[PDB]
Design a protein around this ligand. Structure first.
Ligand SMILES: Nc1ncnc2c1ncn2[C@@H]1O[C@H](COP(=O)(O)OP(=O)(O)OP(=O)(O)O)[C@@H](O)[C@H]1O
Ligand SMILES: [Mg+2]
Ligand SMILES: [Mg+2]
Ligand SMILES: [Mg+2]
Ligand SMILES: [Mg+2]
Ligand SMILES: [Mg+2]
Ligand SMILES: [Mg+2]
Ligand SMILES: [Mg+2]
Ligand SMILES: [Mg+2]
Ligand SMILES: [Mg+2]
Ligand SMILES: [Mg+2]
Ligand SMILES: [Mg+2]
Ligand SMILES: [Mg+2]
Ligand SMILES: [Mg+2]
Ligand code: NA
Lengths: 151, 65, 116, 75
RNA sequence: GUAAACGAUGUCGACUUGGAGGUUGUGCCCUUGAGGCGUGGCUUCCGGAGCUAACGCGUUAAGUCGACCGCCUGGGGAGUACGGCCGCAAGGUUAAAACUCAAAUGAAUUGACGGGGGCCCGCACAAGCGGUGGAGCAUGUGGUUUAAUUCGAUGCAACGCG
């Protein structure tokens, strides 16, 4: 951080689908190294999402991700010893990472049944713009618009 | 200061004209100096200027740069 | 009313505010706006963005006169000095000549004290 | 106002609302859920359904399409 | 009638290598063209010998000499008290002692420090994940108690430690 840099950590793509976004989703939502316990959750969620949406891969994940991925966000960039937040332009690589974290947090909330169902409902809501995950995006947009004075 | 400058199309080009009086004079006349702090400030400013020739004097080294 | 054709803009900026006034060429004020009154109370009304907002807020609400040419006159050096002529030109105005008038004494009255 | 439990995270299940009042159709589209903690104000002119929507969310005006939903522990 | 009224350097005169400039006079000359060649007055910066405790001064000496004047004799007490003179007054000028200490003081050197500066680093901040601080129990430590609650470690670097 202070001096050095990193190329990246290469990730093995998804087993069932020819993609890596879903593998990173599994990595984000697993816990205690229980990848074999997160895999069933994610695949069950994408099973019960396709039947309600009408498509298997795009409408399952991407359309619920592009309604929750952020565009700008606030960071502390004081100059003269103050504390006001300065909005910044988020980068394309971090957009998906932020979106998936927000979706997984919204799905960890909303406690009704198994996580394989909580995530499915939260993702349908994300695809329609109806969840807490998209509410977080709207709130951060409000903050950035309000602090748009500093640039 | 007053400019028409019809020849450009929405190009300010008033930098040259604003860099005549506004930047320095108004910032100077905002507060009273002392009548004796101006002389000290001028003396220090013009004593630092002659250090430019002393810096110029330092070129004559190989320095392996 | 009276459909004034060519007008005068006053951009009175300062280290705490930026007041923008649209008037006729004789000096009868048509409409004014200010960064502080645009909903920016505090340190946020010193930024050039607030001046940009005030310029548009003054260009609006004066379409009752339908002005096409504006002679801008800039006073009181501050953050909203160059960021307001573009905000006016982003409102449908002909910025003909940008006069800069600014009070300069020839060593007149004594200024205030120096702060600490 | 006192302190409730405020447990249910899904406040209601909203889908294909089609509120009509029988003779006509009043509203058919809908917006984001109440997502506990949200504060929403309904603008709009008169005779536009601002009260039909309130009664539909309250549960005293059954939608013609059906399944307007409401969480288990909402007071 | 007092100032850090300060180049903290009394006035006058004589002598003793150079360099880069500023401003103000003058003669000659290829002003033959925004130029050269000499000579005075004032002035800024750097520097040789020499001088100096060092810092530095260095032809405008703090160098080498002469004339005249003013002032100093450890730090406090103290530029104070009393007295005289001056002042409308505030005060100014001249000016002690008793007592007390063995030190005050200048310049420079090595460190340390700065809410002084410059350049780099560290899971230091930032970006994240998971925790302690809340409840039950285990263990240690202080406290209080007791016939004894054996002794030691007790900021970081003692407290699941000997
Ligand atoms: N009980 C009813 N039966 C039939 N039509 C009704 C009934 N109540 C309301 N409507 C109709 O539904 C429409 C909206 O009525 P509603 O009371 O919801 O209005 P609103 O937009 O909330 O405005 P307001 O401020 O007047 O209450 C109107 O056209 C009205 O005539
Ligand atoms: Mg003031
Ligand atoms: Mg005195
Ligand atoms: Mg004196
Ligand atoms: Mg003097
Ligand atoms: Mg003296
Ligand atoms: Mg004499
Ligand atoms: Mg010298
Ligand atoms: Mg006295
Ligand atoms: Mg006396
Ligand atoms: Mg002294
Ligand atoms: Mg505990
Ligand atoms: Mg013990
Ligand atoms: Mg241990
Ligand atoms: Na109503």
């Amino acid at each position: 951080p202070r001096r050095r840099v990193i190329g990246q950590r290469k990730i093995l793509p998804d087993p069932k689908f020819g993609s890596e976004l879903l593998a990173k989703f599994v990595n984000i939502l697993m816990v205690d190294g229980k990848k074999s316990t997160a895999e069933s959750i994610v695949y069950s969620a994408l099973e019960t999402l396709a039947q309600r949406s009408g498509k298997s891969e795009l409408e399952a994940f991407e359309v619920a991700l592009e309604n929750v991925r952020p565009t700008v966000e606030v960071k502390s960039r004081r100059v003269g010893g103050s504390t006001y937040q300065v909005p910044v332009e988020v980068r394309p690589v971090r957009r998906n990472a932020l979106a998936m974290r927000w979706i997984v947090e919204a799905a960890r909330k909303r406690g009704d049944k198994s996580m394989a169902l909580r995530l499915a409902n939260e993702l349908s809501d994300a695809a329609e713009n109806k969840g807490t995950a998209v509410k977080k995006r709207e709130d951060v947009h409000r903050m950035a618009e309000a602090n748009k004075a500093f640039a | 200061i007053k400019v028409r400058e019809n020849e450009p199309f929405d190009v300010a080009l008033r930098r040259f004209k604003r860099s005549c009086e506004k930047a320095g004079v108004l910032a100077e006349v905002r507060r009273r100096e002392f009548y004796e702090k101006p002389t000290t400030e001028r003396k220090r400013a013009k004593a630092s200027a002659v250090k430019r020739h002393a810096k110029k004097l330092a070129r004559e080294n190989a320095r392996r740069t | 009313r009276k459909q004034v054709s060519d007008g005068v803009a006053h951009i009175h900026a300062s280290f705490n505010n930026t007041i923008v006034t649209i008037t006729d060429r004789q000096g009868n004020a048509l409409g004014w706006a200010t960064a502080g009154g645009s909903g920016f109370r505090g340190s946020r009304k010193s930024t050039p963005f607030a001046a940009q907002v005030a310029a548009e807020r003054c260009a609006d609400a004066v379409k009752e006169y339908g002005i096409k040419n504006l002679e801008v006159m800039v006073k009181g050096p501050g953050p909203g000095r160059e960021s307001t002529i573009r905000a006016l030109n982003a409102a449908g105005f002909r910025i003909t000549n940008i006069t800069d008038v600014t009070p300069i004494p020839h060593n007149g009255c004594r200024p205030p004290k120096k702060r600490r | 106002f006192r302190a409730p439990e405020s447990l249910p995270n899904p406040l209601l299940k909203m889908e294909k609302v089609s509120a009509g009042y029988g003779d006509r159709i009043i509203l058919d589209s809908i917006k984001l859920n109440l997502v506990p903690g949200s504060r929403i104000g309904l603008l709009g002119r008169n005779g536009a359904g601002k009260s039909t929507l309130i009664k539909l969310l309250a549960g005293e005006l059954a939608p013609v399409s059906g399944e307007i939903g409401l969480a288990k522990g909402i007071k």
